[PDB]
Amino acid sequence: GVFNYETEATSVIPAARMFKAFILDGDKLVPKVAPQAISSVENIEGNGGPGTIKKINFPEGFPFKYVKDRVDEVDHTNFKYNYSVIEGGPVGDTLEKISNEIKIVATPDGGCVLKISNKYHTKGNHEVKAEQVKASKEMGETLLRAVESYLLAHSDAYN
Ligand SMILES: C[C@H](CCC(=O)O)[C@H]1CC[C@H]2[C@@H]3CC[C@@H]4C[C@H](O)CC[C@]4(C)[C@H]3C[C@H](O)[C@]12C
Ligand SMILES: C[C@H](CCC(=O)O)[C@H]1CC[C@H]2[C@@H]3CC[C@@H]4C[C@H](O)CC[C@]4(C)[C@H]3C[C@H](O)[C@]12C
């Protein structure tokens, strides 16, 4: 079946800029600013639209060596990004796939809020504990704060 988890994260950076830096060009920026969490991102095939497959490689010592993301949908206008984890780690073992949605919304103070939705499609009767998924939240937060710090220090980037 499916386990649905949702979380939110806030940022002081405006939505359009965060969307462009973190999501659209995250395969280039994240490995640069957060090498301790993502060693590299490889484009397997596609040019960025639906069907694009990317391989996310993790640093030595991490539990899983890599996962592959497949881009499902991209709304450059309302800042919505849908992608699926289709291979690697537990996927293919206890999970069939993970479907995620990221929506970035502007706040009146000039910042933004990232609304994250994760749907874990399990295999058989495996249970995904809400406590075990906290690891994806912390990873998410780490990457976000690293990109935010970079964007505050380089005003000319991703304008
Ligand atoms: C695979 C996990 C979590 C999956 C889940 O548990 O729901 C997610 C959590 C944060 C994700 C990263 C966010 C920043 C980047 C977004 C890019 O567009 C694709 C590469 C990066 C580096 C993403 C790679 C991968 O998609 C991660 C590391
Ligand atoms: C905890 C769940 C579910 C595990 C299960 O049901 O067996 C799994 C599913 C996908 C897993 C993530 C895959 C991407 C990353 C791999 C890294 O090497 C460790 C951190 C991350 C972010 C993993 C954290 C955690 O291991 C998750 C979120």
mmCIF file of C-alpha atoms and ligand atoms in Angstrom:
data_model
loop_
_atom_site.group_PDB
_atom_site.id
_atom_site.type_symbol
_atom_site.label_atom_id
_atom_site.label_comp_id
_atom_site.label_asym_id
_atom_site.label_seq_id
_atom_site.Cartn_x
_atom_site.Cartn_y
_atom_site.Cartn_z
ATOM 1 C CA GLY A 1 0.000 0.000 0.000
ATOM 2 C CA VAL A 2 0.956 3.637 0.524
ATOM 3 C CA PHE A 3 2.240 5.599 3.527
ATOM 4 C CA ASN A 4 1.783 9.362 3.205
ATOM 5 C CA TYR A 5 4.083 11.785 5.022
ATOM 6 C CA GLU A 6 4.099 15.563 4.837
ATOM 7 C CA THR A 7 6.391 18.214 6.199
ATOM 8 C CA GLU A 8 7.180 21.910 5.716
ATOM 9 C CA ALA A 9 10.352 23.966 5.756
ATOM 10 C CA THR A 10 10.743 27.736 5.782
ATOM 11 C CA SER A 11 13.400 29.870 4.091
ATOM 12 C CA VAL A 12 14.297 33.555 4.034
ATOM 13 C CA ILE A 13 14.967 33.388 0.283
ATOM 14 C CA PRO A 14 12.181 34.297 -2.203
ATOM 15 C CA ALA A 15 10.285 31.389 -3.800
ATOM 16 C CA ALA A 16 11.226 31.859 -7.473
ATOM 17 C CA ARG A 17 14.910 32.078 -6.647
ATOM 18 C CA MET A 18 14.833 29.077 -4.281
ATOM 19 C CA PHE A 19 12.897 27.059 -6.830
ATOM 20 C CA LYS A 20 15.492 27.740 -9.539
ATOM 21 C CA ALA A 21 18.548 27.116 -7.369
ATOM 22 C CA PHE A 22 17.465 24.235 -5.149
ATOM 23 C CA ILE A 23 15.166 22.334 -7.485
ATOM 24 C CA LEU A 24 15.784 23.127 -11.124
ATOM 25 C CA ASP A 25 19.565 23.413 -10.851
ATOM 26 C CA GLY A 26 19.988 21.425 -7.672
ATOM 27 C CA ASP A 27 21.922 18.745 -9.545
ATOM 28 C CA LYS A 28 24.641 21.339 -10.125
ATOM 29 C CA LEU A 29 24.472 23.501 -7.005
ATOM 30 C CA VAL A 30 23.907 20.976 -4.211
ATOM 31 C CA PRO A 31 27.024 18.839 -4.769
ATOM 32 C CA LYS A 32 28.992 22.106 -4.770
ATOM 33 C CA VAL A 33 27.665 23.508 -1.477
ATOM 34 C CA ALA A 34 26.939 20.256 0.400
ATOM 35 C CA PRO A 35 29.693 17.720 -0.507
ATOM 36 C CA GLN A 36 29.382 16.052 2.873
ATOM 37 C CA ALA A 37 25.821 14.966 2.017
ATOM 38 C CA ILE A 38 25.759 14.476 -1.777
ATOM 39 C CA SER A 39 29.005 13.493 -3.519
ATOM 40 C CA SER A 40 27.561 13.883 -7.033
ATOM 41 C CA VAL A 41 24.514 13.795 -9.293
ATOM 42 C CA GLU A 42 24.691 12.088 -12.682
ATOM 43 C CA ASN A 43 22.255 12.755 -15.515
ATOM 44 C CA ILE A 44 21.392 9.344 -16.934
ATOM 45 C CA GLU A 45 19.022 10.456 -19.657
ATOM 46 C CA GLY A 46 16.561 13.168 -20.613
ATOM 47 C CA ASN A 47 16.875 16.939 -20.696
ATOM 48 C CA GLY A 48 14.968 17.945 -17.573
ATOM 49 C CA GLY A 49 11.368 17.267 -18.487
ATOM 50 C CA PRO A 50 9.125 14.292 -17.566
ATOM 51 C CA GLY A 51 11.028 11.021 -17.834
ATOM 52 C CA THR A 52 14.427 12.494 -16.983
ATOM 53 C CA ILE A 53 16.483 10.119 -14.867
ATOM 54 C CA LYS A 54 19.230 11.220 -12.473
ATOM 55 C CA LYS A 55 21.517 9.208 -10.196
ATOM 56 C CA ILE A 56 22.144 10.677 -6.757
ATOM 57 C CA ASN A 57 25.369 9.367 -5.200
ATOM 58 C CA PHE A 58 26.007 9.557 -1.464
ATOM 59 C CA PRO A 59 29.338 10.000 0.367
ATOM 60 C CA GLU A 60 31.322 7.025 1.646
ATOM 61 C CA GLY A 61 30.014 5.742 4.960
ATOM 62 C CA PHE A 62 26.326 6.502 4.244
ATOM 63 C CA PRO A 63 23.831 3.569 4.553
ATOM 64 C CA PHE A 64 22.893 3.487 0.865
ATOM 65 C CA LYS A 65 25.265 4.186 -1.998
ATOM 66 C CA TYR A 66 22.787 5.904 -4.335
ATOM 67 C CA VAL A 67 19.184 6.289 -5.542
ATOM 68 C CA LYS A 68 17.791 7.206 -8.939
ATOM 69 C CA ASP A 69 15.225 9.942 -9.348
ATOM 70 C CA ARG A 70 12.833 10.192 -12.274
ATOM 71 C CA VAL A 71 11.256 13.596 -12.970
ATOM 72 C CA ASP A 72 7.489 13.257 -13.225
ATOM 73 C CA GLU A 73 6.170 16.806 -13.615
ATOM 74 C CA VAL A 74 7.530 20.364 -13.448
ATOM 75 C CA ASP A 75 5.493 23.565 -13.084
ATOM 76 C CA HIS A 76 7.984 26.406 -13.655
ATOM 77 C CA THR A 77 5.126 28.835 -13.048
ATOM 78 C CA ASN A 78 3.582 27.870 -9.712
ATOM 79 C CA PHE A 79 6.782 26.262 -8.402
ATOM 80 C CA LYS A 80 5.641 22.656 -8.127
ATOM 81 C CA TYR A 81 7.993 19.715 -8.708
ATOM 82 C CA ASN A 82 7.009 16.039 -8.794
ATOM 83 C CA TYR A 83 9.534 13.232 -8.921
ATOM 84 C CA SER A 84 9.876 9.571 -7.972
ATOM 85 C CA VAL A 85 12.658 7.523 -6.383
ATOM 86 C CA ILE A 86 12.651 4.501 -8.676
ATOM 87 C CA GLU A 87 15.810 2.573 -7.827
ATOM 88 C CA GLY A 88 18.424 2.167 -5.118
ATOM 89 C CA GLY A 89 18.508 1.731 -1.372
ATOM 90 C CA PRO A 90 15.284 0.104 -0.114
ATOM 91 C CA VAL A 91 13.532 0.646 -3.449
ATOM 92 C CA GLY A 92 13.326 -2.770 -5.094
ATOM 93 C CA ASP A 93 13.591 -4.413 -1.694
ATOM 94 C CA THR A 94 10.871 -3.368 0.772
ATOM 95 C CA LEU A 95 9.520 -0.524 -1.380
ATOM 96 C CA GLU A 96 8.256 -0.392 -4.933
ATOM 97 C CA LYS A 97 8.839 3.353 -5.261
ATOM 98 C CA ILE A 98 8.595 6.718 -3.526
ATOM 99 C CA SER A 99 6.581 9.524 -5.153
ATOM 100 C CA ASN A 100 7.360 13.028 -3.984
ATOM 101 C CA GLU A 101 5.958 16.478 -4.454
ATOM 102 C CA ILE A 102 7.578 19.771 -3.635
ATOM 103 C CA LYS A 103 5.594 23.007 -3.734
ATOM 104 C CA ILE A 104 7.246 26.318 -2.881
ATOM 105 C CA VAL A 105 4.980 29.166 -1.770
ATOM 106 C CA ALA A 106 5.905 32.809 -1.176
ATOM 107 C CA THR A 107 5.414 34.486 2.203
ATOM 108 C CA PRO A 108 4.688 38.248 2.669
ATOM 109 C CA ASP A 109 8.069 38.962 4.249
ATOM 110 C CA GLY A 110 9.974 38.035 1.108
ATOM 111 C CA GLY A 111 10.722 34.454 2.136
ATOM 112 C CA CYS A 112 9.088 31.150 1.264
ATOM 113 C CA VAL A 113 7.751 27.846 2.547
ATOM 114 C CA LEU A 114 8.493 24.478 0.982
ATOM 115 C CA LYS A 115 5.652 21.978 1.320
ATOM 116 C CA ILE A 116 6.943 18.463 0.957
ATOM 117 C CA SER A 117 4.832 15.378 0.335
ATOM 118 C CA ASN A 118 6.299 11.863 0.267
ATOM 119 C CA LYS A 119 4.297 8.766 -0.694
ATOM 120 C CA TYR A 120 5.983 5.442 0.081
ATOM 121 C CA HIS A 121 4.584 2.575 -1.995
ATOM 122 C CA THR A 122 5.483 -0.587 -0.103
ATOM 123 C CA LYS A 123 6.010 -4.158 -1.171
ATOM 124 C CA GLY A 124 3.998 -6.796 0.671
ATOM 125 C CA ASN A 125 3.174 -5.895 4.253
ATOM 126 C CA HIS A 126 6.257 -3.830 5.098
ATOM 127 C CA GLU A 127 5.661 -0.931 7.519
ATOM 128 C CA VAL A 128 7.328 2.455 7.061
ATOM 129 C CA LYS A 129 7.657 3.915 10.545
ATOM 130 C CA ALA A 130 7.133 7.668 10.903
ATOM 131 C CA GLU A 131 10.314 7.689 13.001
ATOM 132 C CA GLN A 132 12.449 6.125 10.283
ATOM 133 C CA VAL A 133 11.422 8.751 7.703
ATOM 134 C CA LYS A 134 12.762 11.556 9.911
ATOM 135 C CA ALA A 135 16.081 10.836 8.211
ATOM 136 C CA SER A 136 14.760 12.147 4.894
ATOM 137 C CA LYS A 137 13.539 15.294 6.685
ATOM 138 C CA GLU A 138 16.964 16.021 8.224
ATOM 139 C CA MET A 139 18.673 15.383 4.880
ATOM 140 C CA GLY A 140 16.199 17.758 3.253
ATOM 141 C CA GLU A 141 16.799 20.452 5.884
ATOM 142 C CA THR A 142 20.581 20.121 5.661
ATOM 143 C CA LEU A 143 20.594 20.604 1.876
ATOM 144 C CA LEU A 144 18.113 23.481 2.131
ATOM 145 C CA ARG A 145 20.174 25.387 4.723
ATOM 146 C CA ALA A 146 23.333 24.878 2.671
ATOM 147 C CA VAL A 147 21.732 26.292 -0.457
ATOM 148 C CA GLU A 148 20.132 29.113 1.521
ATOM 149 C CA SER A 149 23.506 30.112 3.014
ATOM 150 C CA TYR A 150 25.034 30.169 -0.486
ATOM 151 C CA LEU A 151 22.190 32.271 -1.923
ATOM 152 C CA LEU A 152 22.498 34.827 0.877
ATOM 153 C CA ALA A 153 26.269 35.106 0.243
ATOM 154 C CA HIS A 154 25.998 35.382 -3.573
ATOM 155 C CA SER A 155 23.259 37.894 -4.409
ATOM 156 C CA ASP A 156 23.943 37.711 -8.152
ATOM 157 C CA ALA A 157 23.321 33.965 -8.429
ATOM 158 C CA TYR A 158 20.063 32.639 -9.821
ATOM 159 C CA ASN A 159 18.529 36.111 -10.029
HETATM 160 C C1 LIG B 1 15.879 10.781 -2.202
HETATM 161 C C2 LIG B 1 15.773 11.818 -1.145
HETATM 162 C C3 LIG B 1 14.481 11.554 -0.226
HETATM 163 C C4 LIG B 1 13.372 10.650 -0.761
HETATM 164 C C5 LIG B 1 12.279 10.432 0.201
HETATM 165 O O1 LIG B 1 12.542 9.795 1.238
HETATM 166 O O2 LIG B 1 11.123 10.841 0.032
HETATM 167 C C6 LIG B 1 15.792 13.336 -1.588
HETATM 168 C C7 LIG B 1 15.641 14.334 -0.390
HETATM 169 C C8 LIG B 1 16.267 15.667 -0.852
HETATM 170 C C9 LIG B 1 16.624 15.389 -2.349
HETATM 171 C C10 LIG B 1 17.639 16.322 -2.996
HETATM 172 C C11 LIG B 1 17.155 17.828 -2.989
HETATM 173 C C12 LIG B 1 18.181 18.782 -3.683
HETATM 174 C C13 LIG B 1 18.393 18.360 -5.166
HETATM 175 C C14 LIG B 1 17.071 18.519 -6.042
HETATM 176 C C15 LIG B 1 17.344 18.136 -7.494
HETATM 177 O O3 LIG B 1 16.159 18.284 -8.263
HETATM 178 C C16 LIG B 1 17.833 16.616 -7.561
HETATM 179 C C17 LIG B 1 19.094 16.505 -6.711
HETATM 180 C C18 LIG B 1 18.918 16.859 -5.250
HETATM 181 C C19 LIG B 1 20.299 16.723 -4.523
HETATM 182 C C20 LIG B 1 17.833 15.894 -4.519
HETATM 183 C C21 LIG B 1 18.289 14.391 -4.559
HETATM 184 C C22 LIG B 1 17.226 13.476 -3.872
HETATM 185 O O4 LIG B 1 16.012 13.602 -4.559
HETATM 186 C C23 LIG B 1 17.031 13.864 -2.352
HETATM 187 C C24 LIG B 1 18.406 13.686 -1.549
HETATM 188 C C1 LIG B 2 13.328 5.143 6.173
HETATM 189 C C2 LIG B 2 12.924 5.055 4.755
HETATM 190 C C3 LIG B 2 12.197 3.679 4.523
HETATM 191 C C4 LIG B 2 13.046 2.425 4.722
HETATM 192 C C5 LIG B 2 12.249 1.197 4.678
HETATM 193 O O1 LIG B 2 10.996 1.175 4.651
HETATM 194 O O2 LIG B 2 12.885 0.112 4.670
HETATM 195 C C6 LIG B 2 14.009 5.277 3.619
HETATM 196 C C7 LIG B 2 13.414 5.282 2.162
HETATM 197 C C8 LIG B 2 14.377 6.133 1.290
HETATM 198 C C9 LIG B 2 15.549 6.440 2.264
HETATM 199 C C10 LIG B 2 16.440 7.616 1.917
HETATM 200 C C11 LIG B 2 17.143 7.442 0.515
HETATM 201 C C12 LIG B 2 18.074 8.652 0.171
HETATM 202 C C13 LIG B 2 19.187 8.808 1.238
HETATM 203 C C14 LIG B 2 20.209 7.585 1.258
HETATM 204 C C15 LIG B 2 21.306 7.832 2.299
HETATM 205 O O3 LIG B 2 22.216 6.738 2.304
HETATM 206 C C16 LIG B 2 20.639 7.988 3.757
HETATM 207 C C17 LIG B 2 19.671 9.162 3.678
HETATM 208 C C18 LIG B 2 18.543 9.018 2.683
HETATM 209 C C19 LIG B 2 17.682 10.319 2.718
HETATM 210 C C20 LIG B 2 17.583 7.742 3.008
HETATM 211 C C21 LIG B 2 16.915 7.891 4.420
HETATM 212 C C22 LIG B 2 15.992 6.671 4.737
HETATM 213 O O4 LIG B 2 16.751 5.467 4.715
HETATM 214 C C23 LIG B 2 14.839 6.564 3.677
HETATM 215 C C24 LIG B 2 13.928 7.893 3.675
#
